Amino acid sequence: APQVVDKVAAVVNNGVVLESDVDGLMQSVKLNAAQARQQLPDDATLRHQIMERLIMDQIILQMGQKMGVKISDEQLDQAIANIAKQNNMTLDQMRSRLAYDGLNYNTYRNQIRKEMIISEVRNNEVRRRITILPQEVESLAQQVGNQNDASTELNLSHILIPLPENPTSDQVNEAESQARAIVDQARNGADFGKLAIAHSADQQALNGGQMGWGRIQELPGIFAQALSTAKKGDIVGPIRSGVGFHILKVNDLRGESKNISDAAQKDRAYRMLMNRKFSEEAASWMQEQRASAYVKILS
Amino acid sequence: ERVVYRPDINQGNYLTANDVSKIRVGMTQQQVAYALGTPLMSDPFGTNTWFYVFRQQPGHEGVTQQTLTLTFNSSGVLTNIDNKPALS
Amino acid sequence: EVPDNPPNEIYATAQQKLQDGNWRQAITQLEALDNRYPFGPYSQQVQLDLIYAYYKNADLPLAQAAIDRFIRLNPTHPNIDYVMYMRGLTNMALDDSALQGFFGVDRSDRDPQHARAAFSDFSKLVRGYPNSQYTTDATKRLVFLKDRLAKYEYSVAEYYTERGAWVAVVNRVEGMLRDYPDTQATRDALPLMENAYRQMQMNAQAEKVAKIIAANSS
Amino acid sequence: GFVVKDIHFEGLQRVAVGAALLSMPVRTGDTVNDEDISNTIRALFATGNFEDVRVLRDGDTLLVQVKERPTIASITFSGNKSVKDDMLKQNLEASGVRVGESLDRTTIADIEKGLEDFYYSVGKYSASVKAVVTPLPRNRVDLKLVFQEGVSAEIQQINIVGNHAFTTDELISHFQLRDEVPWWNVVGDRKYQKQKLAGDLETLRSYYLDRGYARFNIDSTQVSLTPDKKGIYVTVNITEGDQYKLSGVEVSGNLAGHSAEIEQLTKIEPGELYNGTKVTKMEDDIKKLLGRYGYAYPRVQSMPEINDADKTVKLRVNVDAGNRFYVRKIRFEGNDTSKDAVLRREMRQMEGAWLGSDLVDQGKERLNRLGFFETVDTDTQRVPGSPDQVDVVYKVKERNTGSFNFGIGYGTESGVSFQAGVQQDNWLGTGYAVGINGTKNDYQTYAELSVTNPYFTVDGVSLGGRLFYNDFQADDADLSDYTNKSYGTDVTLGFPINEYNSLRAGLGYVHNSLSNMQPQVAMWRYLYSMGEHPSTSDQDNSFKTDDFTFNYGWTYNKLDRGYFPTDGSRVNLTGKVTIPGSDNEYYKVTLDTATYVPIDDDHKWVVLGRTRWGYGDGLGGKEMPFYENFYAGGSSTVRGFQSNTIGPKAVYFPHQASNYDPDYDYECATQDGAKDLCKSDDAVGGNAMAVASLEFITPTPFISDKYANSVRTSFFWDMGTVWDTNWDSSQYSGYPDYSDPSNIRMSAGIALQWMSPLGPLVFSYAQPFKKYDGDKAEQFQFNIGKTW
Amino acid sequence: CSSDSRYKRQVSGDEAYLEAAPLAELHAPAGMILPVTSGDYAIPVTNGSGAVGKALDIRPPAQPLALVSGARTQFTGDTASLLVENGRGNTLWPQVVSVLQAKNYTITQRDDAGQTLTTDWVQWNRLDEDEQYRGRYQISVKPQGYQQAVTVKLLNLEQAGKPVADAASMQRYSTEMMNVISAGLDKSA
Amino acid sequence: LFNSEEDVVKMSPLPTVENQFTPTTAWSTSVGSGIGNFYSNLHPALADNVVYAADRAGLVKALNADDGKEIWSVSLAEKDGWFSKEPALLSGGVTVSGGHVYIGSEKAQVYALNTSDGTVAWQTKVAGEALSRPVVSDGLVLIHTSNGQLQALNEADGAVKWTVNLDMPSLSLRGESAPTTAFGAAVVGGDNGRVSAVLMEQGQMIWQQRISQATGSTEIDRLSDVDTTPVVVNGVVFALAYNGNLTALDLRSGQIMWKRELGSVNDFIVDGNRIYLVDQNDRVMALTIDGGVTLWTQSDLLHRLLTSPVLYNGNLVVGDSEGYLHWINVEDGRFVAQQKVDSSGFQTEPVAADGKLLIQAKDGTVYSITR
């Protein structure tokens, strides 16, 4: 019988997703899950999120092509430092990629080009969207006083239940019910990582929604007021910020009384303000692009 | 005997005493055309001759004609002027 | 009128109706093909058949439009000589009349616009494609159109001789001598030019024209 | 890593396999990986010709499955009511969507929006558009655009700010855009059009400059929509300035020796108000005057020097005549039927002569007055590479100058019968006017031929001839009934005397022979005047007369056109007088008049005054023959009356008929039932006649301009009377006084004329609200051919 | 209303232009020249011979349809060639043969080794002609680059028992045979 | 020609509600012909328990708030008969301050009637149709003409203190934005979609910032008019554009803080930590002030042309084009009550002040609503 080699899985603005991309990220996420010990759900729920990530990636790649952004070979050389984890394992060749694709070179190099191009255009657009006000910087700096108040550092897992920019009340209550159900499951004992892989519109869904270690002030504010009162492992109910309902889990926390001795505090405060602004504008702009873009999943 | 309306049959190109007095021997064809205008009649049978005919037939009053013949040389320089103010 | 059968069956019906000799239903079928399938194995063939059927049906404006579009779309087509011949034919066809022809009326006095256009197209065909299959008939038609145009000029010159506009007569006959020197109408017009010269008392030029007449009427 | 033995394509319909293969990164070679297949799929889609692309492997064979973007089979605009299909179709074509083109489904929304945009350009902002895609069998699609046109936006106000000399109502009354529509103006609307606001602003500027305001300026204009976008507001901010007076006009430049006339054109009353349109008309008049002398392309520019302190304006007019232009050739286009000389003999501008333009316009109006062409236009084209010569081209569209009349009467009831006639004004494009008429019955035969050469001589002398034959004798002469057999010939020669007047003189011969006439007062009076003494109690009698006549006439014609004139007046006088030697002596004269006065600048609304007069009488002791009498009534003279019914009625003496049928179908004076003089309804006409008519011609309401030249609608009021001047009123006191002209019949109604393929057709409905006993009424009338 | 069988394949005219008088030049007398001709209405002297008037067939030149997927189809003097694509391979020759077997034509020569064949005679039932043509044809398939290509050629054409070699007729009835072949191949697919 | 060929059915039906209370009409008084079918800004004005109302031709009337009894009336339509009796075309709405009653006019006139009896203290010619509602502050009367010009007439004598030009697009929505007092500044909208801030002293522009997306194809898709009144709270300016974004801006710097695809030409309300809004589609919504998140939405009145909302007795009140007044709970979109007040529609904004709610119908009838 004839064997299907490749096919179009999704149609986007003048682009197509091939089945050799869904499978690649499927194997990637399965391998990461196996190394991370975190069990992952059934073929279809994992497939929907991978397809969504690929639609968003294709949209961003076509925007980069339209806008005349290209990547240098030295950028690939630098990405070899972290993308291939050469610093952790001392070997240059593609024999480290033992899992799948037969240790091929071109495939992983193109994958890295895909990530660098997405990151570059994402950064450029989000940076061009940021507005900084001197008053806010002064306020945040004066907040950064009294022995570096709120020096709490957090590693958190996040889940986003999306809503369109102009949603209907029907959609509002649907999203509300979904978010409350996820929150109830998380609070009742369900593993948040498994919930995050199954139920999430964020880019980090495929990674389980982990945001990594950060500082509370870096939060867009929508999370910090609720988050100041929470212990390790707690589940925070649904919130809003324009892009949909938000759910947060406190994976880990670590605090210390270190104080940096303003001359050097203003620059740091500007850094954290830029971090929060980038995180919020990135989420808003990625949601806007998803709503605007043309797409027709294929089956 | 011929008591029927006949319109004026104007033929040729308008000539005035001043214009006819502006041209002189030695003038080039461009200067003559500038002074008198493009001739409505030339010699097509192998000569550089320009005919400035001025016909007027107001009706049954009788036709009048002034014919000015300008003969140029091969180089385009006016060589001879022959002005006939009335018919024979 | 036109069903929704595949292009193959529509073309088969159009060919059958052209062979039968009915132009209107065949015109409908080829127009359906052209509008519905502007590309494919049948393209250009439909346009050639449309030109032929429009010509045979006396739909001359549509034949001209089809010929123009075909020429401007497929200048390199091997059978473009046929298209130019059909352009000449449809322009000559626009130059004729039925009732006047029935009554034996000489139409050379009427508008020569279409005859001029037909002459231009036939000259283009003959010069561009000397070896074409239609070159002999095109040459014969050119000789006829040249005679017609010279006769039109002669008619105008004769009228102005009647009116008494001698400059107009001289200019018309000179234009005939410069444009249609070898037509019979030019030989007939020369006496008009001589008379016009004499009436203006330009005896030297009347003498030259009389010399020409004596040297050639013999 | 595998060798591709073969590549097979599936699903290709429009894209040739060659083009697809050229669009492929693969060359049927080998050394192929999975990534190569992925790149091939991506490249195929990048071509933009495919909606779905798939690659399959069957052993060593490459199966390429492609779903081409379906093809548009038909586009159906359903629901659109104000935007017409052709227009909307052209707009959608311009957008890149057409039948056969592959439907890129990623743009349907776009085209929908584009259509809405067009509606916005139409004045419909709240309009909705939706595209329905219906799949067909051969992977084609019908793209039906369903239209929900919104309620049109209307102007709620037009406001002018800064106007103090004139009220807002008066200023906006002249605008095309209107805020309020009068209740009686059902055809008006409050729709807003950008082109109209532009013209209304120009109208306001002209109004203010024409009433004396050299400094008038429009500061700005604002157009706004109501939130719901069903109302429109217009505001115009203006600055009147102040009123100015003219100080003087001084002309300078190269006047070419025409200073005296140009200075006479630029005359102003000292201290008059400034006027922009007057200045424009002075410019145009100077240009026209220069054109009369061959200066076809002069430059005339006027600049006003303003004096704000004194508040007076002095016009400085700079004139440069330029070269005197000559005509090189005169060409005629569109005369596919008309002979070239037919058009060329109407020219007042000679070919090889200096230009005047007045002559060119004269030739154009001569051609229009000819009536052979529907449209006439002129174009003076400069000869390329020549500074002093032009070519005058007249472009004409030919008409149907002929008209046909046909009919059948009794049919086969008695032998055979028919009626026919043709009239051509440009027979075979030769300029000849030809006409044939005939009728056949068992009770009548008639034949008539007419041929006229309008240019028998180059100057315009026309020569015409006419033959006619008429008979009333029945076949085989069954019985001695009334009979009237006549024939004759007529030769006429005409010649012009002005650009608009012509005279005619000719000779005619007519033979008449009547017999078995019914005795009646008028005919017997005429016969007694002739010296005959026919009996009165019996119907057996005979009478024969040969007549030679001299015919004369005069025609003045200055009409706008030869058909459906919109301006000018035409007068035609005709007459005849018997040459001494005829069997009877008399004179006759007729006079027709038709004047057109336009009321609209476009000549759409016209007033037509038509008139006809006629008088005849004997010379010696004779009298005008009763077969030359005048008749009135019918579609030609007085609509609403039966043909030839107005006028005196026959009065019959008692007598015995030559036949006696049992049907009692005999005149009142039949001897069987009558013994005294009795009247009848049989119209006999009179030797004096006077008819008049006033018509108001209006545009046809339910036809586009493409047929405007073909249909004419009018409302008419007609008056007419006929009387017999010799009626002996002293006797016959018991019968109407037929010599009285005061018995004027009148009618009023509506008429429609159509230039059908069979010539002119005239329909009319007329109520004869004034009539006298014996007149036969005919409200609805239909006619073929040139009426009056 | 009334019509004749020959209204087809005929010129929409009176054919009166064939009676136009021939053009003759004017002699220039001694001591002068004739006005220089513009050359705008010059008629080049072409020595070609061909049909004129009613004898000229104005029916459009029959171009090969190329129904089966292909391109760069052509019609030569007496032969016609069609180029195919889509991976036909050697299998093209069997199909061609089968197609010509479906027409039950009188195949006289069958050289499968050379991929050639030849028939005796086939007739055409055309409503367009006053007399029906017939021709003898030879068909073959040969390799070109990646794939095979079909070619159809005419040995001769005959009317009313006599031969004819008009270029238009040869082209028409070679496009006829080529269309037959292409339609058969498309039907088989 | 044909009156049965053009109609679009896009109007919501009258919702059914259980009114928690019984709306009542304390009093009603006729004021001239009224606004009429024309789109205008005319509306009553409440000052010291006196109700000032006007008419399109002009019938300035003062009515008691308690029982609608009048204390003085005047007509500004050709009092001296300069030309017949032309309408004053009043469309500025009644403004009340300092014993003066300021009214605009589409004849480019601004009247400053007196409080005691209506005597016209002064009348000033302005750059154009005074469509905007006059704003009295710092001894100045700010007007925004239809031709895009912000003028500041002197309060005492009506002399034009200064003038500022604003860009005008080829097409816009009827109406103009009323400036805001702010702190010695004036924050105004514009038909071009750019919010501007101008100092009160003179016309020195302080900042300008675009508020509309205006990503359209043709003019009708670029309607970026800011016809609302910018609202200043704690140093942030809230603005709202038609087919544009509801945005918050720094009062002095002018940089936007956040944006939301929400458009309207009706004034919104900023109360506490909430923003009550009525969108261009007649969709009543409630947002928060810190960020745009639509706290709740209501659509039962969609496409029923509504007036701007007013906060009254702790609940939101809106009129409609059919004359029905609707009460809405602030906490949620549920209707609290509904009433029929007039047969002619309600177009111009209601007034809610001193524990009293007033409205004016298109026919000019001033209504007082109680309980």
From Swiss-Prot, chain A:
EC number of the protein: 5.2.1.8
A Pfam family of this chain: SurA_N
Molecular-function GO terms, alphabetical: peptide binding; peptidyl-prolyl cis-trans isomerase activity; unfolded protein binding
Subcellular localization(s) per the UniProt record: Periplasm
Boundaries of every PpiC domain copy: 151-252
Keyword Lipid biosynthesis among UniProt keywords: no
Keyword Cell inner membrane set for record: no
InterPro entries named among the record's database cross-references: OMP_Chaperone_SurA, PPIase_dom_sf, PPIase_PpiC, PPIase_PpiC_CS, PPIase_SurA, SurA_N, Trigger_fact/SurA_dom_sf
Catalytic reaction annotation: [protein]-peptidylproline (omega=180) = [protein]-peptidylproline (omega=0)
Recorded GO CC terms: outer membrane-bounded periplasmic space
Keyword line: Chaperone, Isomerase, Periplasm, Repeat, Rotamase, Signal
GO terms for biological process, alphabetical: chaperone-mediated protein folding; Gram-negative-bacterium-type cell outer membrane assembly; maintenance of stationary phase; maintenance of unfolded protein; protein folding; protein stabilization
Superkingdom as given in the UniProt entry: Bacteria
Principal location: periplasm
Role summary: Chaperone involved in the correct folding and assembly of outer membrane proteins, such as OmpA, OmpF and LamB. Recognizes specific patterns of aromatic residues and the orientation of their side chains, which are found more frequently in integral outer membrane proteins. May act in both early periplasmic and late outer membrane-associated steps of protein maturation. Essential for the survival of E.coli in stationary phase. Required for pilus biogenesis.
HAMAP family: Chaperone_SurA
Name of the featured protein: Chaperone SurA
Lineage of the species this protein comes from: Bacteria, Pseudomonadati, Pseudomonadota, Gammaproteobacteria, Enterobacterales
Gene giving rise to this polypeptide: surA
Swiss-Prot record, chain C:
Keywords of the record: Cell outer membrane, Lipoprotein, Membrane, Palmitate, Signal
InterPro entries: BamD (IPR017689), BamD-like (IPR039565), TPR-like_helical_dom_sf (IPR011990)
Source domain of life: Bacteria
Transmembrane segments: none
One of the protein's GO biological processes: protein insertion into membrane
Places the protein is found: Cell outer membrane
Gene3D superfamilies with a match to the protein in the record: Tetratricopeptide repeat domain
GO-annotated cellular components: Bam protein complex; cell outer membrane; membrane
Pfam families, alphabetized: YfiO
Keyword Lipoprotein: yes
Gene inactivation effect: Depletion decreases the density of outer membrane proteins, but does not significantly affect transport of lipopolysaccharides to the outer membrane.
Membrane topology qualifier: Lipid-anchor
The keyword Lipoprotein is annotated on this UniProt entry: yes
Similarity comment text for this entry: Belongs to the BamD family.
Database matches in NCBIfam families: OM_YfiO, PRK10866.1
Domain-level remarks: The N-terminal may interact with various proteins as a chaperone to assist in the folding and insertion of proteins into the outer membrane. The C-terminal region may serve as the link between BamA, BamC and BamE.
Name listed for the protein in its UniProt record: Outer membrane protein assembly factor BamD
Lineage: Bacteria, Pseudomonadati, Pseudomonadota, Gammaproteobacteria, Enterobacterales
Gene from which the chain derives: bamD
Swiss-Prot record, chain E:
Membrane topology: Lipid-anchor
Domain observations: Contains two well-defined domains connected by a flexible linker. The C-terminal domain may serve as an important protein-binding surface for interaction with other Bam components or substrates. In addition, contains a long unstructured N-terminal region, which is required to stabilize the BamCD complex. Only the N-terminus of this protein is observed in the Bam complex in X-ray or EM structures, most of the protein must be highly mobile.
Subunit structure: Part of the Bam complex, which is composed of the outer membrane protein BamA, and four lipoproteins BamB, BamC, BamD and BamE. Forms a subcomplex with BamD and BamE. The Bam complex has the shape of a hat, with the BamA beta-barrel crown in the outer membrane and the periplasmic brim formed by the BamA POTRA domains and the 4 lipoproteins.
Protein name: Outer membrane protein assembly factor BamC
Source organism (scientific name): Escherichia coli (strain K12)
Organism ancestry: Bacteria, Pseudomonadati, Pseudomonadota, Gammaproteobacteria, Enterobacterales
An example molecular function term from Gene Ontology annotations: identical protein binding
Lipidation (N-palmitoyl cysteine): 1
Keyword set, alphabetical order: Cell outer membrane, Lipoprotein, Membrane, Palmitate, Signal
Lipid anchor positions (S-diacylglycerol cysteine): 1
Keyword Ribosomal protein (UniProt): no
Residue stretches spanning the membrane: none
GO CC aspect terms: Bam protein complex; cell surface; membrane
Lipoprotein among keywords: yes
Swiss-Prot record, chain F:
Family assignment from sequence similarity: Belongs to the BamB family.
Gene3D superfamilies per UniProt: YVTN repeat-like/Quinoprotein amine dehydrogenase
Membrane topology listed for this record: Lipid-anchor
Full protein name: Outer membrane protein assembly factor BamB
GO biological process assignments: Gram-negative-bacterium-type cell outer membrane assembly; protein insertion into membrane
GO CC list: Bam protein complex; cell outer membrane; membrane
GO molecular function, one term: identical protein binding
UniProtKB keywords: Cell outer membrane, Lipoprotein, Membrane, Palmitate, Signal
Primary location recorded for the protein, binned into one broad class: membrane
Compartment(s): Cell outer membrane
Function of the molecule: Part of the outer membrane protein assembly complex (Bam), which is involved in assembly and insertion of beta-barrel proteins into the outer membrane. Nonessential member of the complex, which may orient the flexible periplasmic domain of BamA for interaction with other Bam components, chaperones and nascent outer membrane proteins. Efficient substrate folding and insertion into the outer membrane requires all 5 subunits.
Highest taxon in the source lineage: Bacteria
